[PDB]
């Protein structure tokens, strides 16, 4: 399928790296490297809120993955059931002569079993009569459409919380990735280095004055020399503080670049997985809508044509479900290795 093992690997790597991040105020303050900053966007409270949101998203991924795997198994089983039963029914109806195929209608077969053909629904209930089989299959297809829709909603909500958009409940959610980008831009466009350079230039001029005074005198100049010494001491303490803060901000920018890279890699994978589940949901909806065209008054030839149209998408559905199962097994084994 279009969703590869590398895609799931990228998603799981993003989840792991996001779980390695701290989510408490003290842990956030230790990670960012400061307890306070003059920049309101980089305040520790906002950073802690963003980290906590990322942490909750990473926690939600496990439930999303489980839902995807469980519904893929269910779709493979339901597709095998529907395909095999429908093929048996179609072959049995095709074996009878053309004259009965044209004169008889579907209703002439609904009240009796079609040559020991049986169908078991999602509630483990068995149906033997053809009409009961068709109604049970219709209900199963509707329920599988609902379940596939729920899984697609889960995957879409995960991806939208990552990149941004309107969630399933109508809530407008700003993506965690653009928020990471905004914070990184705040880290990269500030005047910390400017203040550092200005203070350092003042200190260098005063140090040149101190050097010249020391070289030249050894009374009024002595007091000026000591005044310059005290001024240099104060400005140097300020420079040390601001230099530590600026180094922390620069390193945090690097860390946020890494977070952004991981989020970007996960985004493509989520796009692929969402597309695959949407394709399967569309095929199931096509099957349900075609089943809506079945009635007892139809001739056996028309019924065979319509029922072929009904059960055709389930072949692709079960193929895609088996592909998802295989890719998940391979990717999880490779991640455990």
Residue numbers in the entry: 41 to 258, 287 to 405
The authors write:
α-Xenorhabdolysin is a PFT that has been first isolated from the bacterium Xenorhabdus nematophila. Xenorhabdolysins are also found in other entomopathogenic bacteria, such as Photorhabdus luminescens, and human pathogenic bacteria, such as Yersinia enterocolitica and Proteus mirabilis. They are composed of two subunits, namely XaxA (45 kDa) and XaxB (40 kDa) and are only active when the two components act together. Xenorhabdolysins, which were suggested to be binary toxins, perforate the membranes of erythrocytes, insect granulocytes and phagocytes and induce apoptosis. In contrast to previous predictions, XaxAB is therefore not a typical binary toxin, but rather a bi-component α-PFT.
